[PDB]
Amino acid sequence: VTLDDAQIALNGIYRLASGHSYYGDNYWYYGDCRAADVQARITKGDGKRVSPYYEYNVLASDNLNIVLPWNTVYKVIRQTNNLIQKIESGSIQSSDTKELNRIKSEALVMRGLSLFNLTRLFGMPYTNDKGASLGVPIETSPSDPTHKPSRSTVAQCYEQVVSDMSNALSGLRQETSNGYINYWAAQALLSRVYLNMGEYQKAYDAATDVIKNNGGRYQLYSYEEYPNVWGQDFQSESLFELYITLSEPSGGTGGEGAPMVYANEATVDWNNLILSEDFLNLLNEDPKDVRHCLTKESVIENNTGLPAAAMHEKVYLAKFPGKTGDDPKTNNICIIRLSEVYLNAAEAGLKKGTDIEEAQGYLNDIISRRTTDTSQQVSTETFTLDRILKERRKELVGEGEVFYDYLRNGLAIERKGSWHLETLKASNAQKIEATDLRIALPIPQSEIDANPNIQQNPR
Numbered sequence: 001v002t003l004d005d006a007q008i009a010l011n012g013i014y015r016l017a018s019g020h021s022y023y024g025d026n027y028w029y030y031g032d033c034r035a036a037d038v039q040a041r042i043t044k045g046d047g048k049r050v051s052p053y054y055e056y057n058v059l060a061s062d063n064l065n066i067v068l069p070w071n072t073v074y075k076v077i078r079q080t081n082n083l084i085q086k087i088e089s090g091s092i093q094s095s096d097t098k099e100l101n102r103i104k105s106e107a108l109v110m111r112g113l114s115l116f117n118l119t120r121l122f123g124m125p126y127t128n129d130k131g132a133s134l135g136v137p138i139e140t141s142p143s144d145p146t147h148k149p150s151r152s153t154v155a156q157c158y159e160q161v162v163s164d165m166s167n168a169l170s171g172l173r174q175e176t177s178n179g180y181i182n183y184w185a186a187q188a189l190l191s192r193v194y195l196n197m198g199e200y201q202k203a204y205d206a207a208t209d210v211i212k213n214n215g216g217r218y219q220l221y222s223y224e225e226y227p228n229v230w231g232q233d234f235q236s237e238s239l240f241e242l243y244i245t246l247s248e249p250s251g252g253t254g255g256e257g258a259p260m261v262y263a264n265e266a267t268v269d270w271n272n273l274i275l276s277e278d279f280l281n282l283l284n285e286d287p288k289d290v291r292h293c294l295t296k297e298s299v300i301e302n303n304t305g306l307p308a309a310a311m312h313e314k315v316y317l318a319k320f321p322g323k324t325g326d327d328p329k330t331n332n333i334c335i336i337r338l339s340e341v342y343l344n345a346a347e348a349g350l351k352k353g354t355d356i357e358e359a360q361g362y363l364n365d366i367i368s369r370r371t372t373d374t375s376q377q378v379s380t381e382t383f384t385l386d387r388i389l390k391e392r393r394k395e396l397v398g399e400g401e402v403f404y405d406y407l408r409n410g411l412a413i414e415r416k417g418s419w420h421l422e423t424l425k426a427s428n429a430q431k432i433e434a435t436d437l438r439i440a441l442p443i444p445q446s447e448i449d450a451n452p453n454i455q456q457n458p459r
């Protein structure tokens with residue numbers, strides 16, 4: 001009915017996105033445990049946390065890992081469609097066009113982000129085949145529940161993502177907006193989207209808009225600051241971050257939330273994410289790297305809940321310790337931050353083959369703020385893709401993106417570290433090519449059973 005009712009609906013969409021089965025957990029840690037740096041601690045079998053993703057053996061029947069993540073993101077999409085339609089139908093009793101348009105624009109970005117998230121889990125990487133293969137169903141109007149849609153292609157899905165985020169931009173806030181999507185967040189997310197389409201110039205344009213034009217609203221963390229920002233709400237790099245307390249969601253991000261699944265607990269309980277030897281070896285290539293501050297040994301000495309080779313290693317990631325430093329369930333959920341935007345620009349620049357010096361500068365903006373060893377900075381000769389991808393692994397560990405770094409670059413993922421789980425042998429997941437059929441998660445069996453127009457991903 002009222003403008004405030006519309007805002008409350010939008011707040012509900014953000015709350016759902018922060019919840020279990022969306023960014024609370026599955027969409028947070030998927031892009032880490034599928035790569036080589038963050039592994040399961042222990043195998044738990046089908047329907048349990050982390051391991052079915054990590055082992056590349058998750059089934060269409062998996063409620064925790066397939067049914068819930070699919071259905072939850074579609075619920076968000078449906079809510080965005082209902083809200084957008086309510087606004088457009090003229091049946092909100094408000095003359096405040098600017099605010100109605102802002103709410104609509106934020107809903108549009110959330111709709112696009114949601115479709116992107118589904119597409120990248122359940123579809124083969126766009127860059128394998130210009131998105132020719134199957135993506136997911138596209139909904140842009142309230143659900144026709146008589147209607148059984150079909151999966152659109154990955155490219156059709158990306159077109160809709162790009163449209164939604166782009167069409168949103170002029171209605172979004174220019175000012176900083178803690179907890180919500182503004183113009184800067186949307187352009188940052190577009191840089192991620194375009195990069196994973198191999199649309200390097202468009203990625204570069206979006207990322208550099210944020211870098212050059214944000215107006216001092218956002219700042220890269222200094223070396224001195226870096227250890228202290230983690231767990232603190234809305235720090236200077238954060239472009240879009242969902243607000244969490246123990247009151248909303250009730251219980252914060254809960255036991256299943258990524259922060260608890262990474263937790264370094266006094267009694268082993270919820271944890272199922274630890275750093276691999278691949279990651280520690282990479283970070284140890286530079287002993288002056290400030291990011292060593294985020295790797296911690298088990299607080300339980302002589303912990304028999306770890307693989308024996310990891311017992312005393314610094315395999316706990318401390319990025320999400322909570323607002324007071326000892327309750328991870330209170331940690332906010334940063335969706336995208338400025339370091340990723342600089343890295344996206346660096347990668348897009350190198351790949352497109354122009355603006356090279358500027359692009360190299362953006363890589364060095366990260367390197368120079370993360371180490372005191374000046375020789376780590378790149379020249380044109382040492383500005384290579386591998387060097388960028390190494391920096392991304394160091395910078396963005398735990399933030400849900402590293403998997404896609406391999407996929408969009410056609411790179412095989414190898415789990416070489418000595419404490420990777422033995423289940424990777426039985427599941428044939430020590431090496432995953434970017435063309436491996438198992439990269440595309442199975443469509444939920446609930447969909448297959450219900451809708452004969454929905455094809456399953458091959459195996």
Ligand SMILES: [Zn+2]
Pocket residue numbers: 144146147148
């Ligand atoms: Zn129909």
Ligand SMILES: [Zn+2]
Pocket residue numbers: 156159
């Ligand atoms: Zn099209």
Ligand SMILES: [Zn+2]
Pocket residue numbers: 297301302311312
């Ligand atoms: Zn020890």
Ligand SMILES: [Zn+2]
Pocket residue numbers: 357
């Ligand atoms: Zn120069």
Ligand SMILES: [Zn+2]
Pocket residue numbers: 365
């Ligand atoms: Zn600079």
Ligand SMILES: [Zn+2]
Pocket residue numbers: 373374375376
């Ligand atoms: Zn040096």
